[PDB]
Structures are given as structure tokens and as C-alpha cells.
Amino acid sequence: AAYYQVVPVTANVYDSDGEKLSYISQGSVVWLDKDRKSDDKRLAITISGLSGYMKTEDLQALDASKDFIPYYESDGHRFYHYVAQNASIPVASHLSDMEVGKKYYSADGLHFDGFKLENPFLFKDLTEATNYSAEELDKVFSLLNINNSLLENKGATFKEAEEHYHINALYLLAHSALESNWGRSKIAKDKNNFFGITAYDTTPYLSAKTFDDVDKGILGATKWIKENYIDRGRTFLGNKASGMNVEYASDPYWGEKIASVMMKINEKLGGKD
Numbered sequence: 001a002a003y004y005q006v007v008p009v010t011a012n013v014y015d016s017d018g019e020k021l022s023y024i025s026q027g028s029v030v031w032l033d034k035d036r037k038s039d040d041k042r043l044a045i046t047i048s049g050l051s052g053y054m055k056t057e058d059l060q061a062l063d064a065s066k067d068f069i070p071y072y073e074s075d076g077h078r079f080y081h082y083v084a085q086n087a088s089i090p091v092a093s094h095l096s097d098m099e100v101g102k103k104y105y106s107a108d109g110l111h112f113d114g115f116k117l118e119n120p121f122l123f124k125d126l127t128e129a130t131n132y133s134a135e136e137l138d139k140v141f142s143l144l145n146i147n148n149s150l151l152e153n154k155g156a157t158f159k160e161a162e163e164h165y166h167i168n169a170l171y172l173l174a175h176s177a178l179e180s181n182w183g184r185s186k187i188a189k190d191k192n193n194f195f196g197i198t199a200y201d202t203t204p205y206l207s208a209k210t211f212d213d214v215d216k217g218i219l220g221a222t223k224w225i226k227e228n229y230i231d232r233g234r235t236f237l238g239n240k241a242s243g244m245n246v247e248y249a250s251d252p253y254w255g256e257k258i259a260s261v262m263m264k265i266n267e268k269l270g271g272k273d
């Protein structure tokens with residue numbers, strides 16, 4: 001088979017030494033890499049920029065003519081990644097090399113057979129500040145029809161977090177938008193937790209971390225991302241080969257999803273970044 005799907009809740013990706021490189025989510029589709037040796041026990045695969053090996057035990061072969069395989073498609077304005085059969089995200093502007101409504105396939109979302117994608121927000125250094133002011137960030141809620149968000153009118157807190165921790169506020173808004181449904185998930189509302197941060201406050205089971213109010217949620221999560229990711233050499237969103245996506249999320253397209261929200265916000269606010 002050319003394509004395999006991840007069966008367990010997560011599965012590891014290994015190098016040729018058997019060292020763990022990363023982990024990917026249930027349902028993720030990986031490509032067989034025909035330039036490297038596979039055997040009965042491990043397949044040479046590629047996913048989201050990462051070339052490595054996976055245990056056959058963790059995979060199911062697909063038939064691309066009846067099973068969903070992720071693909072990319074242009075509507076003539078933007079290029080969309082179908083990350084699931086019923087869900088697409090805009091990743092880039094249309095290029096004249098793209099045929100409208102043709103499905104295109106890629107192991108990294110940058111290299112295609114007839115064109116090359118720039119995904120600049122996917123690789124942007126997150127320690128550089130956004131050119132958007134607090135008042136401009138606050139406008140995004142009306143421009144994208146985001147109702148009932150706990151992050152409404154918190155642009156000033158995102159820009160404070162950026163000033164103090166040296167982390168891009170557009171990234172902070174986009175990450176909280178993707179991770180918490182714009183501060184509307186149950187964990188956002190219960191716990192002012194907009195970035196998916198977990199903690200054992202000694203409390204036996206792993207749970208979402210509690211923050212005392214919306215502002216302390218934004219500032220506290222920024223501190224946690226600075227200390228756990230930025231300060232440890234994860235300084236861009238990236239994919240399964242490099243950046244925050246290697247460790248932050250099993251979803252191979254978490255970084256692409258956040259970059260897509262940054263692209264949409266930047267377009268709505270006049271393209272200053």
C-alpha cells in the first residue's frame with residue numbers, strides 16, 4: 001500500500017536507530033517512502049515534513065480510491081489543505097501553476113510536483129512582535145464573526161504578554177483561537193485555559209491547568225509557552241520535523257492550522273505582518 005492510517009490514539013515516529021522523533025494522532029495518513037527500506041515490523045513513512053519509521057502494529061493500509069487521503073486544492077483565490085474529508089484550511093494564495101479544482105498531494109505542504117509553497121507564518125520566528133496594535137487585534141472578532149469569545153477586547157492583554165515575554169501577539173491570538181475555539185471551549189470557560197496547557201497540581205490525574213481570570217490565563221499561558229517551548233529552541237510553529245508541532249500536539253497539521261488563522265487575521269487587518 002502507498003498510504004497508511006494511524007490506528008491507536010497516538011503512534012510514535014522513529015528514526016533508523018529506533019529513537020523516537022515525534023508522535024502523530026489517530027486517523028493521520030502517512031505516505032510509504034519508497035526510497036528507504038521497509039520490512040514486516042516497520043515501514044519507512046513520511047508525514048508533515050518528517051521522514052522516519054512506524055511500527056506496522058500502529059498502521060492500517062488504505063486504498064486511495066475508496067479511503068480519504070489528505071489533499072490540497074485551489075478555488076482560484078486560496079489553496080486549501082483537506083486535513084479531513086469534511087474539513088479544509090486555507091494555507092496559501094492561489095498560484096497560476098495551480099489548476100482550479102484539481103487535487104494535489106504533498107508530504108510537507110511546501111513541495112508539489114509543479115510549484116513550491118511559501119507558508120511564511122508556519123516558519124515565522126515567534127519572538128518577533130506583530131505590527132498589529134491591541135485595538136486592531138480587537139477588531140478581528142467582528143471581521144471574522146466570532147461571537148461570545150472570552151478573548152473579545154483582550155487585545156491589550158495579548159500585547160502586554162508580547163511586550164513582557166517577547167512572544168508574537170498575532171501568534172498568541174491564533175493559537176488560542178485554534179486550541180480553544182476562540183476561548184469558547186469548556187476548558188476555556190471553566191479554567192481560563194485558552195492554549196490547552198495541562199498540569200498535575202499534585203491532583204492525581206492530568207487535567208487542564210486552571211488560571212484565575214482571562215488576563216491571567218493569557219499571561220500565564222504565554223509564560224508557560226516561553227519557558228517550555230521558545231526557551232528550549234522551539235521558536236516557530238512548524239510541523240512534525242521541527243518547531244513547536246513536534247511536541248505540542250499529535251495533530252500533524254496543528255502548526256498549519258494556527259498559521260492558517262494567522263494568515264486569515266493578517267488578511268482581514270490589512271496585511272501589516
Ligand SMILES: CC(=O)N[C@@H]1[C@@H](O)[C@H](O[C@@H]2O[C@H](CO)[C@@H](O[C@@H]3O[C@H](CO)[C@@H](O[C@@H]4O[C@H](CO)[C@@H](O)[C@H](O)[C@H]4NC(C)=O)[C@H](O)[C@H]3NC(C)=O)[C@H](O)[C@H]2NC(C)=O)[C@@H](CO)O[C@H]1O
Binds near residue numbers: 247
Ligand atoms: C480542521 C480544523 O481546523 N480543526 C480544528 C480543530 O483542530 C480544533 O480543535 C483543537 O484541535 C487541536 C489539535 O489541532 C487539539 O489539540 C490537542 O491539544 C492537546 C493539548 O491541550 C495536545 O496534548 C498533547 O498530548 C501529548 C500526549 O498525547 C502530550 O505529550 C503533549 O504534552 C500535549 N500537549 C500539551 C501542550 O500539553 C493534543 O495532542 C492535541 N490533540 C491533537 C489531536 O493534536 C485541541 O484540543 C482542539 N481543541 C478543542 C477541541 O477545543 C477545533 C477547536 O478550535 O477547531 C477545528 O476547527
Ligand SMILES: [Ca+2]
Binds near residue numbers: 015017019
Ligand atoms: Ca538518532
